[PDB]
Write a protein that binds this ligand. Structure first.
Ligand SMILES: Nc1ncnc2c1ncn2[C@H]1C[C@H](O)[C@@H](COP(=O)(O)OP(=O)(O)OP(=O)(O)O)O1
Ligand SMILES: [Mn+2]
Ligand SMILES: [Mn+2]
Length: 425
DNA sequence: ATTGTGACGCT
DNA sequence: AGCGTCAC
């Protein structure tokens, strides 16, 4: 009823760079622009593993996780850019530094939560109030929303439809009510157009975005119209949108929890969750998950945009699959040193840029025969940014996992070093 | 023989 | 603390 909180208090956007690693390589190498092309890691096994794919290449069926040899079967003219190799492993520095370029621009407009290397949430609530006060009642022109889709419109050529839906939306707006959530979302979308224009002018990178009242809806919205477009998902659009939305498409429901929601309740679509009481959902999925589901299927989520532009952890990982598994102590020591040297480089740079020091070193490994991705995770003190010391300490901490009696058994299929627990410096 | 990350929850 | 889930 009237006391029914509608979860319409905030304006939240999710900005995601289109095929980000590919764009980084296309900026650097103009020969790759506007072409089917992908970014690959390594090159020996089946041509390398594809980790990013241009939209031209996606049209042929090329996807992430595909081997390059197989992608070339689908797309014989596919162009490839290789991830840099340093110290025997893939090194993602070029893409981290490009991400920082973009995040720094986004931070001029509003508070950002770095959600991954290529995407960030934006809390636009205060920016919208400021922009509304600056407007003082004038209507919002379609010209201010040149790449915006209004989800669910029009109702009652793709660009033609986009413009029809946008006109229907803007005609319907009550511009004189500064408290209308729909108006607030629209102004948020204006600001996000400006943000996206700034990113493209100052980096060359294009991105898509979602604008809604919370992070889950903003992330869902972002994927509705890609690439190089943005989508506004209003509170009112939620019943129709969710009525045919597979549960696995909502952030955090793509895994075993979503599968159990489907199996236990006997439903397929997000909207079907509205038929259950909060207590019913809590009984199946726990107190937190149940309350979250009960609100989220109504379009309501309260998870804040956290003020956090930097990663909380700095990690270095390598898999050693099949016959590359490590079977000698020297092999284990040498790779621990390689990882620790990349970690030391990145940490020293982080301490200089961001005025902080890590204090905990996490060491994880995967043993051949383990079906788990991580077999053992142990922590030690990180007291100095010294690669030899970090590697000696990781060895000291994992050494009792060798069940042999110079050899290493069972052979190691993964090494992982992660610097955590940062404190101001 | 998806790899290399990175955030967060549970107990 | 160590392990598990989820998504890029
Ligand atoms: N499994 C992975 N392994 C390594 N890198 C990955 C993996 N998944 C995603 N990435 C990298 C490459 C991507 O360019 C970057 C951003 O991821 P993501 O937003 O999901 O897709 P994308 O930016 O490549 O295309 P788009 O967002 O337009 O669909 O992170
Ligand atoms: Mn992306
Ligand atoms: Mn992304």
């Amino acid at each position: 009823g009237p006391h029914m909180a509608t979860g319409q208090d905030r304006v939240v956007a999710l900005v995601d760079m289109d095929c980000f690693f590919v764009q980084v390589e296309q900026r650097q190498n103009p020969h790759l622009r506007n072409k089917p092309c992908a970014v690959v890691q390594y090159k020996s096994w089946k041509g390398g593993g594809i980790i990013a794919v241009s939209y031209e290449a996606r049209a042929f069926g090329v996807t992430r996780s595909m081997w390059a040899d197989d992608a070339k079967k689908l797309c014989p003219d596919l162009l490839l850019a290789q991830v840099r190799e340093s110290r025997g492993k893939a090194n993602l520095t070029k893409y981290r530094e490009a991400s920082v370029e973009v995040m720094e621009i986004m931070s001029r407009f509003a508070v950002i939560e770095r959600a991954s290397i290529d995407e960030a949430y934006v809390d636009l609530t205060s920016a919208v109030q400021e922009r509304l006060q600056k407007l003082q009642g004038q209507p919002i022109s379609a010209d201010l929303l040149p790449s915006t889709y209004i989800e669910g419109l029009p109702q009652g050529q793709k660009e033609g439809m986009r413009k029809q839906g946008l006109f229907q939306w803007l005609d319907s707006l009550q511009i004189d009510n500064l408290t209308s959530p729909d108006l607030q979302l629209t102004v948020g979308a204006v600001i996000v157009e400006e943000m996206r224009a700034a990113i493209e002018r100052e980096t060359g990178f294009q991105c898509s975005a979602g604008i809604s009242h919370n992070k889950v809806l903003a992330k869902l919205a972002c994927g509705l119209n890609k690439p190089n477009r943005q989508t506004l998902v209003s509170h009112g659009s939620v019943p129709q949108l969710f009525s045919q939305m597979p549960i696995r498409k909502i952030r955090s429901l793509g895994g075993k929890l979503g599968a159990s929601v489907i199996e236990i309740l006997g439903i397929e679509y997000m909207g079907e969750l509205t038929q259950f009481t909060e207590s019913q959902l809590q009984s199946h999925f726990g107190e937190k998950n149940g309350s979250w589901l009960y609100a989220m299927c109504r379009g309501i989520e309260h998870d804040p945009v956290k003020p956090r532009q930097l990663p909380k952890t700095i990690g270095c990982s390598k898999n050693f699959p099949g016959k590359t598994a490590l079977a000698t102590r020297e092999q284990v020591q040498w790779w621990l040193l390689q990882l620790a040297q990349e970690l030391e480089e990145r940490l020293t740079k982080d301490r200089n840029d961001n005025d902080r020091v890590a204090t905990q070193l996490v060491v994880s490994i995967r043993v051949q025969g383990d079906k788990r991705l991580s077999s053992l995770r142990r922590c030690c003190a990180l007291t100095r940014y010294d690669a030899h010391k970090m590697s000696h300490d990781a060895f000291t901490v994992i050494k009792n996992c060798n069940t042999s009696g110079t050899e290493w058994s069972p052979p190691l299929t993964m090494l992982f070093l992660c610097a955590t627990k940062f404190s101001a410096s």
